[PDB]
Amino acid sequence: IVYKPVDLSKVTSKCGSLGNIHHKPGGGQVEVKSEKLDFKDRVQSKIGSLDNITHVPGGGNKKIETHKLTF
Amino acid sequence: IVYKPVDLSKVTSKCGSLGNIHHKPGGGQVEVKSEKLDFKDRVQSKIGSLDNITHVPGGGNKKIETHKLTF
Amino acid sequence: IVYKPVDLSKVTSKCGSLGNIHHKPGGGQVEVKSEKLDFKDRVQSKIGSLDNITHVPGGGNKKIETHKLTF
Amino acid sequence: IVYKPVDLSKVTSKCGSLGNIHHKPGGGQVEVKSEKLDFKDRVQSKIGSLDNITHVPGGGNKKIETHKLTF
Amino acid sequence: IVYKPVDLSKVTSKCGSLGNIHHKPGGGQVEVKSEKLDFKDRVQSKIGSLDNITHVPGGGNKKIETHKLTF
Amino acid sequence: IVYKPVDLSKVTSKCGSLGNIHHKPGGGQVEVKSEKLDFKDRVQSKIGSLDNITHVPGGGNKKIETHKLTF
């Protein structure tokens, strides 16, 4: 005759760099000489003293719920 | 005649670098020479003193629930 | 005639570097020569002094629940 | 007192599809259904009945020669 | 006192599909279904009935020669 | 007092499918199902009825020669 589903729950996802301290995380010196090169097809290149990434394609949630009462 | 499902639960994910201290994580010096090279096909390259990554394609949750009452 | 499912649960996942202290983790000096090379073939290359990764494609949870009452 | 280098040589490269006959090289039927996809990072896709390629990043020549006469 | 180097030589490379007959090389029927997929990172895909490649990053020649006459 | 180096040589390379007859090499019928997949990681996929490749990163020659006459 009576029902009362009580949901007080918590769903949580904490993803990537969080709550951190980085103190003096210095990238060093970088040098890239290059002489008499040929590249007769596609190239991609990346050069850097410091790189720092949080990517996080994940971290997703789904909460799914159902009720019925039937005579 | 009566029911009261109570959910007080917690669902939690904590993913990638978190709560950390990184103190003076210095990248060292890097040097690249390169002479008279032929590349005749697809290339990719990456040169750097310090790199820091958190990736996290994961860390996800799913919470699924159902009730029924039938006469 | 009466029922009261009580769920007080915690579902927890903690993944990748966490709560750590990294103190002076300095990378080495790096030097790369290269002369008269042919790459008639696909290349991918990576050069660097210090490289810190937390990957985590995992770390996920799922929590599935059901009740029924039938006369 | 006298010299006469005679070079009547031939340097030849023949590279990729050449002198061939292709008779009725039919691509077949292709079908690509797709439903309720998510792509939450970079994609590249290729679909086709027939694909025919000559790539040839190579096939090159070099001819190097030197003389001297000295008292 | 006298010299006459004679080079009548031939240097030859013949690379990839050549002089061939391909008669009725028909690709067959292809079907792809795909339902409810998640991709959460880099993807690539290639679908096709008939594919025909000649690549040849090689096939190259080099011919190198030298003379000297010294008193 | 006199010399006459005579080179009548042939340097020859023949690489990949050549002089062949391929008669009715028909690709078979292909069908792909896929349901409810997760890809939380790097994918590369390839689907096809008939695929024909000649690759040849090699097949190259080098011919090196020298003379000298000295009093």
Side-chain angles (χ1 to χ4, degrees):
Chain A
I1 299 179
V2 180
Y3 80 118
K4 294 193 178 179
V6 178
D7 176 2
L8 312 190
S9 67
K10 175 158 58 181
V11 180
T12 291
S13 172
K14 306 190 185 187
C15 293
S17 183
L18 64 96
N20 297 312
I21 297 168
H22 302 236
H23 184 96
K24 299 176 182 183
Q29 175 170 341
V30 180
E31 303 188 25
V32 184
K33 282 289 306 285
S34 280
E35 304 185 23
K36 207 165 182 174
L37 314 187
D38 289 14
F39 296 95
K40 283 165 168 159
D41 195 13
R42 179 176 284 106
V43 184
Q44 71 184 254
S45 181
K46 176 171 174 172
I47 307 171
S49 176
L50 165 62
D51 192 9
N52 188 11
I53 295 179
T54 75
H55 188 57
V56 189
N61 307 287
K62 50 188 169 185
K63 173 66 152 62
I64 297 176
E65 192 149 323
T66 292
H67 310 79
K68 58 176 63 177
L69 170 59
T70 301
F71 187 79
Chain B
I1 297 184
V2 185
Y3 79 121
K4 294 192 179 180
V6 176
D7 179 3
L8 311 195
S9 66
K10 179 162 64 179
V11 181
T12 290
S13 170
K14 299 190 181 188
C15 291
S17 180
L18 67 96
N20 299 306
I21 303 181
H22 302 245
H23 183 98
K24 301 176 181 179
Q29 176 174 331
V30 181
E31 302 184 25
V32 178
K33 286 287 305 281
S34 278
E35 305 185 20
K36 208 170 179 175
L37 320 183
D38 297 12
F39 304 84
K40 281 162 170 165
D41 202 349
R42 176 182 287 98
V43 182
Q44 68 177 264
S45 181
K46 176 175 170 177
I47 304 166
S49 174
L50 172 57
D51 185 5
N52 182 75
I53 306 184
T54 60
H55 195 66
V56 189
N61 306 288
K62 59 188 177 184
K63 170 65 155 67
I64 304 185
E65 193 151 325
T66 293
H67 309 81
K68 61 175 64 176
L69 171 57
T70 303
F71 189 76
Chain C
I1 296 180
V2 182
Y3 82 117
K4 295 190 179 179
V6 180
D7 179 2
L8 310 188
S9 62
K10 176 161 58 179
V11 176
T12 291
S13 176
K14 306 187 186 184
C15 301
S17 178
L18 66 96
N20 294 307
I21 298 169
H22 303 261
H23 187 96
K24 301 174 183 182
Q29 173 171 331
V30 176
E31 298 181 34
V32 174
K33 289 291 307 285
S34 279
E35 303 181 24
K36 208 174 179 180
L37 309 180
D38 298 12
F39 300 94
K40 288 154 170 158
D41 189 17
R42 190 194 301 105
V43 179
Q44 64 186 258
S45 178
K46 177 177 169 187
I47 298 165
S49 173
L50 181 57
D51 177 7
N52 181 61
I53 306 185
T54 73
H55 191 61
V56 189
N61 307 289
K62 66 189 180 184
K63 170 66 160 70
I64 306 184
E65 191 147 321
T66 293
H67 310 82
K68 60 176 65 175
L69 172 59
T70 300
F71 188 82
Chain D
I1 299 179
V2 180
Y3 80 118
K4 294 193 178 179
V6 178
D7 176 2
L8 312 190
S9 67
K10 175 158 58 181
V11 179
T12 293
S13 169
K14 306 190 185 187
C15 292
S17 182
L18 64 96
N20 299 309
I21 297 168
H22 304 249
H23 184 96
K24 299 176 182 183
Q29 177 163 336
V30 182
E31 302 186 29
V32 183
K33 275 292 303 279
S34 279
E35 304 185 21
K36 204 164 180 172
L37 312 187
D38 292 17
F39 298 93
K40 280 166 169 165
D41 201 353
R42 175 178 287 103
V43 185
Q44 66 182 265
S45 180
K46 178 170 173 174
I47 304 170
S49 176
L50 170 57
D51 187 3
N52 180 67
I53 304 185
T54 62
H55 195 65
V56 194
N61 308 287
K62 54 192 175 185
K63 171 67 154 67
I64 304 183
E65 192 149 323
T66 292
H67 310 79
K68 58 176 63 177
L69 170 59
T70 301
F71 187 79
Chain E
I1 297 184
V2 185
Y3 79 121
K4 295 192 179 180
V6 176
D7 179 3
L8 311 195
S9 66
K10 179 162 64 179
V11 180
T12 291
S13 171
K14 299 190 181 188
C15 293
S17 181
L18 67 96
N20 301 304
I21 303 181
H22 304 245
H23 183 98
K24 300 176 181 179
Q29 174 170 337
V30 182
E31 304 183 27
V32 179
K33 284 287 305 277
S34 279
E35 302 183 22
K36 207 165 179 173
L37 319 183
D38 292 18
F39 305 83
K40 280 165 171 166
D41 195 356
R42 175 181 283 95
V43 178
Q44 68 176 264
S45 180
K46 176 175 171 177
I47 302 162
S49 175
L50 176 54
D51 189 358
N52 185 65
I53 304 181
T54 63
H55 197 64
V56 188
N61 306 288
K62 64 190 179 184
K63 171 68 153 67
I64 303 186
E65 193 151 325
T66 293
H67 309 81
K68 61 175 64 176
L69 171 57
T70 302
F71 189 76
Chain F
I1 296 180
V2 182
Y3 82 117
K4 295 190 178 179
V6 180
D7 179 2
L8 310 188
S9 62
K10 176 161 58 179
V11 178
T12 294
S13 171
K14 306 187 186 184
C15 293
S17 180
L18 66 96
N20 294 307
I21 298 169
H22 303 250
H23 187 96
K24 301 174 183 182
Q29 173 175 334
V30 173
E31 298 181 34
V32 176
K33 287 290 308 292
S34 280
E35 300 179 27
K36 207 169 176 179
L37 309 180
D38 294 15
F39 298 94
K40 283 163 170 165
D41 199 351
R42 184 190 299 103
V43 181
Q44 65 178 266
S45 180
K46 177 176 170 179
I47 298 166
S49 174
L50 175 55
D51 183 3
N52 181 67
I53 306 184
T54 65
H55 196 67
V56 193
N61 307 288
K62 54 193 175 185
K63 171 67 156 68
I64 304 184
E65 191 146 322
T66 293
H67 310 82
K68 60 176 65 175
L69 172 59
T70 299
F71 188 82

